[PDB]
Amino acid sequence: LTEEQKETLKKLKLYQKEYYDYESKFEYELFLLRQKYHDLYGPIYDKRREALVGAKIGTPNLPEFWLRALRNNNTVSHVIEDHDEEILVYLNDIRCDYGFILSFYFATNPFFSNSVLTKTYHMHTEATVIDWYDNKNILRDSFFHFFTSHEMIIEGDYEVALTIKERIIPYAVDYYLGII
Amino acid sequence: LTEEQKETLKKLKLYQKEYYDYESKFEYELFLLRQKYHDLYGPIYDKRREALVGAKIGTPNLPEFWLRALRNNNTVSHVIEDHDEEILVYLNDIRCDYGFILSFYFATNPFFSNSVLTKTYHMHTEATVIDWYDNKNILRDSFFHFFTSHEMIIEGDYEVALTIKERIIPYAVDYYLGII
Q: Are strands B91-97 and B100-106 parallel, antiparallel or unpaired?
A: antiparallel
* Cα–Cα distance measured from residue B28 to residue A166, given in angstroms and rounded to the nearest whole number: 18
Say if the Cβ atoms of B52 and A12 lie within 8 Å: yes
Q: Which chain B residues are within 8 Å of A12, Cβ to Cβ?
A: 48, 51-52, 62, 172-173, 176
Q: Are A102 and A165 in contact (CB under 8 A)?
A: yes
**Interface contact B179, partner A, CB < 8 A:** no
Cα–Cα distance between A89 and B164 in angstroms, integer? 48
Partners of B12 on chain A (C-beta within 8 Å) are 48, 51-52, 62, 172-173, 176
Strands of A37-150 (E only): list them: 91-97, 100-106, 116-121, 125-127
Asked if B16 and A171 come within 8 Å (Cβ–Cβ), the reply is yes
Residue of B3, B7, B9 to mutate for A, most A C-beta atoms under 10 A: B9
For residue B118, with 0-12 CB atoms within 10 Å meaning exposed, 13-18 middle and 19 or more buried, which class applies?
Answer: middle
Q: Walk me through the domains of chain A, giving residue ranges and CATH numbers.
A: 1-55 (1.20.5.1500), 56-180 (3.30.1120.90)
Q: Is the dihedral of CA B134, B136, B139, B144 positive or negative?
A: negative
- Phi, psi (5° rounding) for residue B130? -70, 120
Residue A99 burial class via C-beta count within 10 angstroms: exposed 0-12, middle 13-18, buried 19 and up: exposed
Q: How many CA atoms lie within 13 A of B116 on its CB side?
A: 9
How far apart CA B87 and CA B146 sit, in angstroms, is: 14
* Experimental resolution (Å): 2.4
Report which DSSP code applies to A124. Answer: -
Chain B residues with CB inside 8 Å of A9's CB? 62, 173
Question: Quick check: A133 and A90 in contact, CB under 8 A?
Answer: no
A:B CB pairs within 8 Å: 96
Long-range contacts of B36-42 (CB under 8 A, 24+ apart): B37/A22, B37/A23, B37/A25, B37/A26, B38/B98, B40/A22, B41/A19, B41/A22, B41/B170
Dihedral sign (CA A75, A159, B154, A27)? positive
User: What gap in Å lies between CA A57 and CA A87, rounded to an integer?
Assistant: 10
Do B41 and A63 make contact, defined as CB atoms within 8 angstroms? no
A117, A103 Cβ separation under 8 angstroms = yes
Question: What Å distances lie between residue A119 and A58, A69, A162, A170, B87, CA to CA?
Answer: 20, 19, 12, 18, 52
Q: Indicate the residue of A5, A29, A48 with minimum beta-carbon distance to B15.
A: A48
What radius of gyration, in Å, describes the C-alpha atoms of chain B?
A: 22
Calculate the dihedral angle through the C-alpha atoms of B169, A123, A103, A42, rounding to the nearest 10 degrees: -40
* A38 CB within 8 Å of a chain B CB: no
A107: closest CA among A98, A119, A116, A94? A116
Provide the shortest C-alpha distance from residue A121 to chain B (in Å): 24
